[PDB]
Amino acid sequence: LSDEDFKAVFGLTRSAFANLPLWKQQNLKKEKGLF
């Protein structure tokens, strides 16, 4: 997924995602079915 696609899926950029704690990233990926 490119940045725009990622933002379309997660509602935030990959940078904003990386700005999140890794457990939050885990939960988000698991939530959005991309784990």
Positive or negative CA dihedral for 11, 12, 13, 18?
negative
Q: How many domains does the chain have?
A: 1
Q: How far apart are CA 21 and CA 4, in angstroms?
A: 21
How was this structure obtained? NMR
The CATH number covering residue 13 comes to 1.10.950.10
Residue 25 belongs to domain spanning: 1-35
Q: How far apart are CA 30 and CA 24, in angstroms?
A: 10
Q: How far apart are CA 15 and CA 33, in angstroms?
A: 19
